[PDB]
Amino acid sequence: ELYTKYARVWIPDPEEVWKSAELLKDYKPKVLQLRLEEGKDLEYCLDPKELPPLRNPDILVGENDLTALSYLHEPAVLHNLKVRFIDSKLIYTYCGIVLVAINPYEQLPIYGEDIINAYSGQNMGDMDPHIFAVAEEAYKQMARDERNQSIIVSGESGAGKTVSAKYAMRYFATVSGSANVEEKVLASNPIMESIGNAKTTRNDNSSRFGKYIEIGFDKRYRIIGANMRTYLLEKSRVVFQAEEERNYHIFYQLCASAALPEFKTLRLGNANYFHYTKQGGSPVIDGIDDAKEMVNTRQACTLLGISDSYQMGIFRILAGILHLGNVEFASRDSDSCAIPPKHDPLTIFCDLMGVDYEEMAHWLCHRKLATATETYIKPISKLHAINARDALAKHIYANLFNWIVDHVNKALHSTVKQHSFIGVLDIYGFETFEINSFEQFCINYANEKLQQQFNMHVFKLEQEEYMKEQIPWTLIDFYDNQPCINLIEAKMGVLDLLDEECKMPKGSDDTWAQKLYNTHLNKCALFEKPRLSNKAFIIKHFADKVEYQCEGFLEKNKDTVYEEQIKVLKSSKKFKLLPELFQDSKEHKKTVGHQFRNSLHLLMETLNATTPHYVRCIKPNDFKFPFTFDEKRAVQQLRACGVLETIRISAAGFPSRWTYQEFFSRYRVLMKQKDVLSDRKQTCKNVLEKLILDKDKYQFGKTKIFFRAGQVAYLEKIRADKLRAACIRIQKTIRGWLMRKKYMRMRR
Amino acid sequence: TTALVCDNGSGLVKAGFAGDDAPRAVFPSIVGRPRHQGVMVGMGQKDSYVGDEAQSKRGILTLKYPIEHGIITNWDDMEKIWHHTFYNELRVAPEEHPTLLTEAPLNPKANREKMTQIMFETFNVPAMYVAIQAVLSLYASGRTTGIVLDSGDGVTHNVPIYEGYALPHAIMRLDLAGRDLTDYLMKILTERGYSFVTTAEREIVRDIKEKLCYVALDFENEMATAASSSSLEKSYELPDGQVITIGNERFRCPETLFQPSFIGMESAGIHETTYNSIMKCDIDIRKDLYANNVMSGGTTMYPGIADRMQKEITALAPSTMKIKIIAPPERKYSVWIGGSILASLSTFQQMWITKQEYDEAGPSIVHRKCF
Amino acid sequence: FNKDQLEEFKEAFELFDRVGDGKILYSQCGDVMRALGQNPTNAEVLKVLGNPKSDELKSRRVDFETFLPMLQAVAKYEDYLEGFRVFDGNGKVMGAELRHVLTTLGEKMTEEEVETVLAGHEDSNGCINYEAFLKHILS
Ligand SMILES: C/C1=C\[C@H](C)C[C@H](C)OC(=O)C[C@H](c2ccc(O)cc2)NC(=O)[C@@H](Cc2c(Br)[nH]c3ccccc23)N(C)C(=O)[C@H](C)NC(=O)[C@@H](C)C1
Ligand SMILES: Nc1ncnc2c1ncn2[C@@H]1O[C@H](COP(=O)(O)OP(=O)(O)O)[C@@H](O)[C@H]1O
Ligand SMILES: [Mg+2]
């Protein structure tokens, strides 16, 4: 077998996720005699059955493409990235069609202008990987064919998705021949950060939405302009946070400026005074001045041509949402409530918005039914009043966000008709915490859909390459996460039962969980129950299993916005913006899970129109050190980006391809002169058919040999054996001949 | 596809799409035929009228009600009323949409058999179900425990429910009604000299009963009050513009619900059948039934019926045990609202009767699946 | 080995005796075997020596009589040609590649040994006729 003395293996180690070892005696069927670098010697158990991951030869290590490696497993990937990053400082790397970008915190020269002119024209493999190589592969495919192109970027927001997008746009501008997309797009970033980013337990300044920039090209492929869209915004954060989280930065940037005179009308308090900001208990981010960020947000708005009249509108509405949060109900009787007399938060909310106090106080505590002929004003429980108030806050914020994006687009658009576009998606990756909740559940469902699109695109490209090389395409094996997506989204899926439990009377998180267990517990292999609890469930995702706690779900999922409360706000006359938000039914009834599932189907329609290109970003250390690579953090990030699962899917197929001359050169050391022949293709067919016994392992394409995983490492080892033995024989002959001459000299 | 939700009764038909907040089509459920020789030529004489048309024309017509006491008692007129409901008044073809149908409990089985047979054969509805009115009132009022009292035109029935289980032995049914209150109102109104004989006059009496009756909080005290004083006495305008004045009688009319002995039945009133239904339930649940009494259907709309019920049950029930009456203002429609909620649920989509199951089993399937 | 062979070998052995006690070191056993016409690998030499430890390999001394069975045991071209054709197919070998493999793979030799055997054998391109070099080192 492949395990021999003088072979190298990876052993699992808790301090650094894998450690290298050498095998001291050849294996024969329950212990291995293992050398190390950490001391010479160690004794290592085999386990009931297992062999360690076997280590690739050092010709393949440090290749520009992880799927050049003959063994594909977590140790090889982690090592190969570490040696490229630490030794050569090559941050970019490839895996299949994906570009992995490892973020140095240090700045680099490599983005500099000349290289733009160097990459342009070059086919994707002909140059070492760099973000420009993907930017060209899009620009070239757009010019070559009708289709728009998309670039898709994933990872924890620290990982540097924005820097990758920024450089992609510089590539487009500089090759295309430009005006003022780049300066404007980078000018928008502080606004979209302030209103769309959030602070999460694992990460400060997380971005809770997917943001899409459509760069527009003329029929001459000159950059016209750009268009922005936003998807998947999580509304629930506005009303509710877990411990040690904040809702969107803008509320804290607004409260931090409460002293300033233009804000004084808002009567803003200390950031933990209000009900929406205080719940996380975490007002100050370490190492940020919020008041300074407010000034940067305003100046970015001014630079995008939102006049100061509207900026004071925006902050007026946000202070409105904060004051609305403090409104507090007393129950009269178990199915009725009212607001107490002259309640100070409601009075300030009515002053800030203009709506007359009696009408808000009336509508917050009642709802209106109407048949066409008759109308009933009906009281509602204190709980329903709270759910309606929070639904009104979420509805205001979601429309304010959509409005600010419509104005940014008004600055970014330009009049010339867009001939085709290239669209660069910054999204979040797969996400798991000690505690997982409706937010994580929606993020993971979005990532399952994106991962499905990626798997189908890779499978299409590989089918086309197999048909190109005259191989049977029926060999290639397709791996389909549709069974999980059907678990989450199909009828009597998790989301559909959550929506049912919202409306069913006396609904609760316990009765929801019980409906899950009845519906799925042993019917679907992907759904599992944690043994020691009844308030949680486990979904086997693409990447990993994830426990989700039930305790949040129904409280967060509910929206219903009572139509009269909007009609009251819409009637207000004091200022332009508040009527302007709500301008254009069934949608008011929809739950947050259903609005999310619709937004994700729009995103998938937008991407399906387009040919993708992928970037992954990984954050190499937890503490922003300039080049330290922490193999624990990088392993976690590589799992969360699905790179390891991509490599698993690839390793099943034929990952490794050789051109007949390049093969023939390397293995001419093995080949015998009788086998050498006037047709190298036939020569290699003969030699290979002898060297590796089972023809199932390899295929002959028209111009390329394909090999299953490991076979190239096997050939490299037999090559090293033959060359070693030949070297030993010549060395012993030369050593003998010289010492024998010294013997003859003593004889003479 | 949104299921239809249709709620038949004596009196109004209520229909609309599932997931709507309130019913889209509401109209009194009448089939009318002309009873005079048509003299004019080119009049456009029409074989029969349905719903609002029969109300407008009514002076020319005999009005018949095809449902008495929750039983469909001539199937041709009922099939006309469904035809009018789907085609004229909702304007949606039934071959597209599941349908949900509503019935009073403890009805004859043939009423469910025929109602399903007509839905599958004559409208080709792809799937149908039949719910109990009282169960649906609990979905509408937002509960899984309570004793529902639901009284419309036709049937009055109590159904106790406890955490989502019915208690079939405790179901009670009574035939006091908006309708028998109307016939009593005519028979007492005669005592002041006003005689409403024909069916189109009965519709006037029904409108007097809606506008002017109210349930006396204490009966003999208001009888003495009306004897002593005009102050209780109030007046109304018939369609031709004559005025009529009605006195103590206007509270006397809705009281027969509390004392059926007035119309001539012996079975006790809705308070005592509510109490007797609770008493037939086992002793551990009873606190929660007293905590929730849910009223439903139009005959519980009278001003003061909620307070008269709370007082009169409290007098019957043990003194410590808190009695509460839950009378939501919408309660005339709550059987439809409950049907809307139920038809919208995802779990229910399993539970429709489907056309294949009907073709396999024949129309008896309804008894097995529905209740 | 016969008496004549034993006499020639003993004389040679005594020429390699650098201490005068009529003995060699274990570490010299391989040297004597190669000086006597054997071409053992380092592994074979250590094996016939009994895989001695460093201390006795460097300081324990053995006379001819104990050495002899080991010499016997060790004692008991086309592969050489193909082995050289490994490093070629015009019958030449780069001097750099042969130097690298002889100094970095197998039982590594010193650069000076390789220079000594290679002196005068490379042409202006730095190419070695390996059939001639092989005959030379086998002579
Ligand atoms: C002579 C008798 C019965 C009948 C005349 C005998 C005939 C033979 O029975 C039928 O089959 C006819 C019919 C009927 C109608 C439709 C149908 O698909 C099947 C049967 N059912 C009726 O007329 C019911 C309707 C009804 C009232 Br209100 N509440 C009820 C509560 C529950 C159930 C049903 C009802 N009805 C008025 C009676 O029973 C009356 C009160 N019964 C009597 O006075 C006694 C002395 C027996
Ligand atoms: N405000 C009201 N007060 C008293 N009775 C009413 C009122 N509105 C309707 N009704 C009566 O209630 C009956 C209709 O009840 P309803 O439950 O709506 O019928 P259905 O049984 O078809 O649902 C009719 O007798 C009608 O006259
Ligand atoms: Mg009814």
Short mmCIF file of C-alpha atoms in Angstrom, two decimals, chain B:
data_model
loop_
_atom_site.label_atom_id
_atom_site.label_comp_id
_atom_site.label_asym_id
_atom_site.label_seq_id
_atom_site.Cartn_x
_atom_site.Cartn_y
_atom_site.Cartn_z
CA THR B 1 -54.35 28.46 -5.28
CA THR B 2 -56.40 30.20 -2.60
CA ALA B 3 -59.26 28.00 -1.46
CA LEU B 4 -62.73 29.45 -1.42
CA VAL B 5 -64.36 29.69 1.97
CA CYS B 6 -68.12 29.64 1.86
CA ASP B 7 -70.41 29.62 4.86
CA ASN B 8 -74.03 28.78 4.31
CA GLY B 9 -76.83 29.38 6.72
CA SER B 10 -80.40 30.14 6.96
CA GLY B 11 -80.14 33.83 6.41
CA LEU B 12 -76.97 35.26 4.93
CA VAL B 13 -74.45 33.50 2.71
CA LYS B 14 -70.89 34.60 3.45
CA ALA B 15 -68.19 33.83 0.91
CA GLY B 16 -64.72 34.99 0.01
CA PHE B 17 -61.19 33.82 -0.56
CA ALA B 18 -59.09 32.23 2.16
CA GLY B 19 -56.52 34.58 3.64
CA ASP B 20 -58.72 37.63 3.19
CA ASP B 21 -59.50 39.69 6.28
CA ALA B 22 -63.27 39.79 5.69
CA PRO B 23 -65.81 38.17 3.37
CA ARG B 24 -66.04 39.50 -0.17
CA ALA B 25 -69.63 38.46 -0.92
CA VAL B 26 -72.41 38.73 1.65
CA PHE B 27 -76.04 38.52 0.62
CA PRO B 28 -79.26 37.14 2.08
CA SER B 29 -79.91 33.63 0.93
CA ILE B 30 -83.30 33.68 -0.72
CA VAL B 31 -84.72 32.29 -3.92
CA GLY B 32 -87.67 34.19 -5.28
CA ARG B 33 -90.31 33.53 -7.87
CA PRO B 34 -92.85 35.95 -9.34
CA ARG B 35 -96.43 35.42 -8.22
CA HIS B 36 -98.25 37.87 -10.52
CA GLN B 37 -99.14 37.55 -14.17
CA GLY B 38 -96.61 39.47 -16.20
CA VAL B 39 -98.65 41.94 -18.21
CA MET B 40 -96.01 44.02 -19.92
CA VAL B 41 -94.44 42.64 -23.10
CA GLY B 42 -90.69 42.68 -23.44
CA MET B 43 -90.53 43.05 -19.65
CA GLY B 44 -87.55 40.71 -19.48
CA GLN B 45 -89.29 38.20 -17.24
CA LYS B 46 -86.76 36.07 -15.39
CA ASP B 47 -87.33 32.57 -14.08
CA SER B 48 -86.21 33.32 -10.52
CA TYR B 49 -84.03 35.69 -8.53
CA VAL B 50 -81.28 35.07 -5.99
CA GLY B 51 -79.89 37.11 -3.15
CA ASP B 52 -79.92 40.89 -3.31
CA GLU B 53 -82.13 40.91 -6.40
CA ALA B 54 -84.86 39.08 -4.51
CA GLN B 55 -84.53 41.67 -1.74
CA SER B 56 -84.96 44.63 -4.09
CA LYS B 57 -87.83 43.14 -6.14
CA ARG B 58 -89.39 41.56 -3.08
CA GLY B 59 -92.79 43.25 -3.31
CA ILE B 60 -93.49 41.22 -6.47
CA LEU B 61 -92.18 37.88 -5.23
CA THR B 62 -92.71 34.91 -3.01
CA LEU B 63 -89.48 34.58 -1.04
CA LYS B 64 -88.47 31.09 0.05
CA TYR B 65 -85.53 30.19 2.24
CA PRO B 66 -83.91 26.95 1.04
CA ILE B 67 -82.38 26.21 4.47
CA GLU B 68 -84.51 25.82 7.55
CA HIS B 69 -82.69 24.90 10.74
CA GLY B 70 -79.36 24.26 9.11
CA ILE B 71 -80.84 21.59 6.83
CA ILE B 72 -80.99 22.15 3.08
CA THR B 73 -84.65 21.43 2.36
CA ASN B 74 -84.88 21.83 -1.39
CA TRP B 75 -81.76 21.10 -3.39
CA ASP B 76 -82.64 22.92 -6.64
CA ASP B 77 -82.87 26.32 -4.97
CA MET B 78 -79.74 25.63 -2.95
CA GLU B 79 -77.88 24.70 -6.14
CA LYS B 80 -79.05 27.99 -7.65
CA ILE B 81 -77.67 29.87 -4.67
CA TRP B 82 -74.27 28.25 -5.06
CA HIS B 83 -74.37 28.96 -8.78
CA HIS B 84 -74.96 32.62 -7.99
CA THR B 85 -72.21 32.59 -5.37
CA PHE B 86 -69.42 31.27 -7.56
CA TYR B 87 -70.34 32.76 -10.94
CA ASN B 88 -72.21 36.01 -10.30
CA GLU B 89 -70.93 37.25 -6.97
CA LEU B 90 -67.36 35.97 -6.62
CA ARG B 91 -66.82 35.74 -10.41
CA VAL B 92 -64.36 32.87 -10.07
CA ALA B 93 -64.68 29.46 -11.65
CA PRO B 94 -64.91 26.64 -9.09
CA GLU B 95 -62.84 24.28 -11.25
CA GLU B 96 -59.75 26.20 -10.13
CA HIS B 97 -60.19 26.38 -6.37
CA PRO B 98 -60.65 24.08 -3.38
CA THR B 99 -63.77 24.90 -1.40
CA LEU B 100 -64.51 24.85 2.32
CA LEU B 101 -68.08 24.46 3.49
CA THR B 102 -69.64 24.93 6.87
CA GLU B 103 -72.36 23.06 8.75
CA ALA B 104 -74.02 22.98 12.16
CA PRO B 105 -73.07 19.93 14.25
CA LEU B 106 -75.37 16.98 14.83
CA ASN B 107 -77.05 17.45 11.43
CA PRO B 108 -78.27 14.53 9.31
CA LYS B 109 -75.60 12.76 7.29
CA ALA B 110 -77.51 13.08 4.03
CA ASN B 111 -76.94 16.84 4.14
CA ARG B 112 -73.18 16.28 3.97
CA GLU B 113 -73.48 13.55 1.36
CA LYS B 114 -75.58 15.64 -1.00
CA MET B 115 -73.49 18.76 -0.41
CA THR B 116 -70.32 16.93 -1.42
CA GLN B 117 -71.97 15.19 -4.35
CA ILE B 118 -73.11 18.55 -5.73
CA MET B 119 -69.66 20.05 -5.24
CA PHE B 120 -67.84 17.28 -7.11
CA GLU B 121 -70.38 16.46 -9.83
CA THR B 122 -72.10 19.76 -10.59
CA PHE B 123 -69.28 22.26 -10.04
CA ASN B 124 -66.29 19.89 -10.42
CA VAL B 125 -64.55 21.49 -7.43
CA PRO B 126 -61.10 19.88 -7.12
CA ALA B 127 -61.32 19.41 -3.34
CA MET B 128 -63.72 20.16 -0.51
CA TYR B 129 -64.08 19.95 3.26
CA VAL B 130 -66.91 20.53 5.73
CA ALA B 131 -66.20 22.26 9.06
CA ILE B 132 -68.31 22.75 12.17
CA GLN B 133 -69.39 26.34 12.78
CA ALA B 134 -68.51 26.33 16.48
CA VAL B 135 -64.99 25.00 15.95
CA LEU B 136 -64.32 27.80 13.47
CA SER B 137 -65.44 30.43 15.96
CA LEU B 138 -62.51 29.43 18.19
CA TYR B 139 -59.97 29.96 15.43
CA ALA B 140 -61.48 33.36 14.78
CA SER B 141 -61.47 34.41 18.43
CA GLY B 142 -57.93 33.14 18.91
CA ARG B 143 -58.32 30.31 21.42
CA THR B 144 -57.94 26.57 21.82
CA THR B 145 -60.20 26.27 24.85
CA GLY B 146 -63.69 27.51 25.56
CA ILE B 147 -67.34 26.73 25.25
CA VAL B 148 -68.62 28.21 22.04
CA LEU B 149 -72.20 29.39 21.86
CA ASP B 150 -73.16 30.19 18.32
CA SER B 151 -76.65 31.14 17.30
CA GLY B 152 -77.74 32.32 13.91
CA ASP B 153 -80.85 32.15 11.91
CA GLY B 154 -81.92 28.57 12.41
CA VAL B 155 -79.77 26.48 14.74
CA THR B 156 -78.44 27.38 18.17
CA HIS B 157 -75.70 25.07 19.41
CA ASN B 158 -73.09 24.88 22.16
CA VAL B 159 -69.83 23.05 21.57
CA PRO B 160 -67.33 22.79 24.43
CA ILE B 161 -63.71 22.42 23.39
CA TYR B 162 -60.67 21.91 25.62
CA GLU B 163 -57.14 22.24 24.24
CA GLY B 164 -58.27 21.30 20.79
CA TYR B 165 -60.42 18.27 21.63
CA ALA B 166 -64.16 18.34 21.22
CA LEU B 167 -66.38 16.57 23.73
CA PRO B 168 -69.08 15.06 21.54
CA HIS B 169 -71.34 13.92 24.38
CA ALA B 170 -71.58 17.53 25.59
CA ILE B 171 -72.70 19.06 22.29
CA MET B 172 -76.12 20.67 22.60
CA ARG B 173 -78.42 21.85 19.85
CA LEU B 174 -81.53 24.01 20.02
CA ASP B 175 -83.87 25.45 17.38
CA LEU B 176 -84.36 28.91 18.83
CA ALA B 177 -83.23 31.24 16.15
CA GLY B 178 -83.25 34.63 14.60
CA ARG B 179 -86.12 33.15 12.63
CA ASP B 180 -88.31 32.04 15.52
CA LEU B 181 -87.57 35.37 17.21
CA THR B 182 -88.91 36.98 14.04
CA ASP B 183 -92.10 34.90 13.96
CA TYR B 184 -92.58 35.66 17.64
CA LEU B 185 -92.03 39.34 16.93
CA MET B 186 -94.80 39.25 14.33
CA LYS B 187 -97.18 37.42 16.64
CA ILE B 188 -96.61 39.83 19.49
CA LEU B 189 -96.62 42.92 17.24
CA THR B 190 -100.19 42.00 16.34
CA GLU B 191 -101.15 43.03 19.89
CA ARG B 192 -100.53 46.69 19.06
CA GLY B 193 -102.52 46.34 15.85
CA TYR B 194 -99.90 45.78 13.15
CA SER B 195 -100.17 42.65 11.04
CA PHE B 196 -97.28 41.54 8.83
CA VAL B 197 -98.58 38.55 6.92
CA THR B 198 -96.62 38.01 3.73
CA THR B 199 -92.97 37.00 3.41
CA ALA B 200 -91.92 40.40 2.11
CA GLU B 201 -93.55 41.83 5.22
CA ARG B 202 -91.54 39.35 7.30
CA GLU B 203 -88.39 40.97 5.90
CA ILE B 204 -89.64 44.23 7.39
CA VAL B 205 -90.18 42.60 10.75
CA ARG B 206 -86.63 41.27 10.53
CA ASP B 207 -85.34 44.79 9.99
CA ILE B 208 -87.31 46.05 12.99
CA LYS B 209 -85.79 43.26 15.08
CA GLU B 210 -82.31 44.24 13.96
CA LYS B 211 -82.66 47.97 14.57
CA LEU B 212 -84.77 48.23 17.72
CA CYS B 213 -84.74 45.14 19.96
CA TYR B 214 -82.50 44.92 23.03
CA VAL B 215 -82.18 42.37 25.83
CA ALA B 216 -83.55 43.61 29.15
CA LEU B 217 -80.93 43.31 31.87
CA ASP B 218 -83.66 42.48 34.40
CA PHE B 219 -86.95 41.45 32.84
CA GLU B 220 -89.63 42.28 35.39
CA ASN B 221 -88.03 45.61 36.27
CA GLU B 222 -88.10 46.73 32.64
CA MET B 223 -91.67 45.45 32.28
CA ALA B 224 -92.65 47.67 35.20
CA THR B 225 -90.56 50.52 33.77
CA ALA B 226 -92.31 50.31 30.40
CA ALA B 227 -95.70 50.15 32.10
CA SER B 228 -94.85 53.27 34.11
CA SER B 229 -93.30 55.39 31.37
CA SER B 230 -93.21 56.22 27.68
CA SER B 231 -89.45 56.75 27.95
CA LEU B 232 -88.68 53.19 26.81
CA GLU B 233 -90.98 53.45 23.78
CA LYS B 234 -89.53 54.11 20.33
CA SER B 235 -90.74 54.33 16.74
CA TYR B 236 -89.77 53.24 13.24
CA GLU B 237 -90.64 54.05 9.61
CA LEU B 238 -92.03 51.40 7.27
CA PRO B 239 -90.89 51.59 3.62
CA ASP B 240 -94.04 53.44 2.48
CA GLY B 241 -93.38 56.17 5.05
CA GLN B 242 -95.99 55.28 7.65
CA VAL B 243 -94.67 55.29 11.21
CA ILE B 244 -95.22 52.58 13.83
CA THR B 245 -94.51 52.81 17.56
CA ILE B 246 -93.34 49.76 19.52
CA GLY B 247 -93.07 49.68 23.26
CA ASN B 248 -92.12 47.25 25.99
CA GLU B 249 -92.40 44.62 23.27
CA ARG B 250 -89.04 45.50 21.76
CA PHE B 251 -87.20 43.98 24.73
CA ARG B 252 -89.77 41.18 25.00
CA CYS B 253 -88.73 39.83 21.62
CA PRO B 254 -85.08 38.80 22.26
CA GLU B 255 -85.84 37.54 25.77
CA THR B 256 -87.52 34.37 24.46
CA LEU B 257 -83.96 33.11 23.94
CA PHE B 258 -83.70 33.18 27.74
CA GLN B 259 -87.25 31.81 28.23
CA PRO B 260 -88.28 29.55 25.34
CA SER B 261 -91.53 28.98 27.21
CA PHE B 262 -92.78 32.17 25.50
CA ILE B 263 -92.73 30.69 22.00
CA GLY B 264 -94.01 27.44 23.49
CA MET B 265 -90.97 25.16 23.67
CA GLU B 266 -89.92 23.72 27.02
CA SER B 267 -86.16 23.34 26.64
CA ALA B 268 -84.43 25.93 28.79
CA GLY B 269 -82.80 29.07 27.47
CA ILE B 270 -79.32 29.62 26.14
CA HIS B 271 -77.94 30.38 29.61
CA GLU B 272 -79.18 27.11 31.07
CA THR B 273 -78.11 25.06 28.05
CA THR B 274 -74.68 26.68 28.35
CA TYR B 275 -74.52 25.67 32.00
CA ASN B 276 -75.87 22.17 31.33
CA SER B 277 -73.28 21.71 28.61
CA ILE B 278 -70.47 22.68 30.95
CA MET B 279 -71.88 20.31 33.60
CA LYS B 280 -71.78 17.41 31.18
CA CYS B 281 -68.01 17.95 30.95
CA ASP B 282 -65.65 16.27 33.41
CA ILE B 283 -64.82 18.27 36.49
CA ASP B 284 -61.15 19.16 35.92
CA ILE B 285 -61.65 21.26 32.76
CA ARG B 286 -64.69 23.23 33.98
CA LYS B 287 -62.73 26.18 35.33
CA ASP B 288 -61.37 26.87 31.85
CA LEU B 289 -64.78 26.65 30.22
CA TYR B 290 -66.13 29.19 32.69
CA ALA B 291 -63.11 31.35 31.87
CA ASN B 292 -64.02 31.37 28.17
CA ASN B 293 -67.47 31.67 26.66
CA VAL B 294 -67.30 32.68 23.03
CA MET B 295 -70.36 34.05 21.33
CA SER B 296 -70.83 33.75 17.60
CA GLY B 297 -73.38 34.44 14.91
CA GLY B 298 -75.88 37.21 14.50
CA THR B 299 -78.47 36.23 17.09
CA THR B 300 -75.95 37.16 19.79
CA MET B 301 -75.69 40.73 18.49
CA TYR B 302 -78.52 42.16 20.60
CA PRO B 303 -77.32 44.96 22.88
CA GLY B 304 -76.93 43.64 26.40
CA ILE B 305 -77.08 39.91 25.65
CA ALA B 306 -73.47 39.62 26.82
CA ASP B 307 -74.17 41.22 30.19
CA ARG B 308 -77.44 39.35 30.70
CA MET B 309 -75.57 36.11 30.02
CA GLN B 310 -72.72 36.93 32.39
CA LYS B 311 -75.16 37.79 35.18
CA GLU B 312 -77.42 34.81 34.66
CA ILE B 313 -74.59 32.26 34.46
CA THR B 314 -72.91 33.83 37.50
CA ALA B 315 -76.13 33.23 39.39
CA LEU B 316 -76.02 29.54 38.40
CA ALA B 317 -72.30 28.88 38.79
CA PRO B 318 -70.52 28.40 42.13
CA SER B 319 -69.82 31.77 43.65
CA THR B 320 -66.01 31.70 43.70
CA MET B 321 -65.62 30.60 40.09
CA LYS B 322 -64.92 33.54 37.76
CA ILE B 323 -67.37 33.75 34.83
CA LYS B 324 -66.29 35.69 31.75
CA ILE B 325 -68.17 36.27 28.48
CA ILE B 326 -66.13 37.05 25.38
CA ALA B 327 -68.29 38.85 22.81
CA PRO B 328 -66.07 40.32 20.10
CA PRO B 329 -67.76 43.01 18.00
CA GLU B 330 -67.03 41.17 14.74
CA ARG B 331 -68.84 38.05 15.94
CA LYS B 332 -71.45 38.09 13.18
CA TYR B 333 -68.64 37.07 10.77
CA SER B 334 -66.38 35.06 13.04
CA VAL B 335 -67.45 31.71 11.60
CA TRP B 336 -66.19 32.95 8.25
CA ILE B 337 -63.03 34.45 9.71
CA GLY B 338 -62.30 31.14 11.39
CA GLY B 339 -62.85 29.35 8.12
CA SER B 340 -60.38 31.70 6.46
CA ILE B 341 -57.74 30.99 9.09
CA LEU B 342 -58.25 27.24 8.88
CA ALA B 343 -58.15 27.09 5.07
CA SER B 344 -54.97 29.16 5.03
CA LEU B 345 -53.04 26.80 7.35
CA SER B 346 -50.37 24.66 5.73
CA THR B 347 -51.14 21.54 7.78
CA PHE B 348 -54.70 21.59 6.49
CA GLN B 349 -53.60 21.20 2.86
CA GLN B 350 -53.05 17.52 3.64
CA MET B 351 -56.63 17.19 4.83
CA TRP B 352 -58.95 18.22 1.98
CA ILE B 353 -61.10 15.55 0.42
CA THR B 354 -59.70 15.13 -3.06
CA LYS B 355 -61.58 14.27 -6.22
CA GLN B 356 -59.77 10.94 -6.60
CA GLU B 357 -60.72 9.88 -3.07
CA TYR B 358 -64.32 10.70 -3.91
CA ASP B 359 -64.25 8.74 -7.17
CA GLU B 360 -62.74 5.78 -5.34
CA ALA B 361 -64.94 5.77 -2.24
CA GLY B 362 -68.12 7.51 -3.35
CA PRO B 363 -69.87 10.30 -1.48
CA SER B 364 -69.74 8.50 1.88
CA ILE B 365 -66.08 9.56 2.26
CA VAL B 366 -67.14 12.81 3.96
CA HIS B 367 -68.19 11.02 7.13
CA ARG B 368 -64.80 9.35 7.44
CA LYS B 369 -62.55 12.35 6.81
CA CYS B 370 -64.46 15.42 7.92
CA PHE B 371 -65.80 14.68 11.40
#
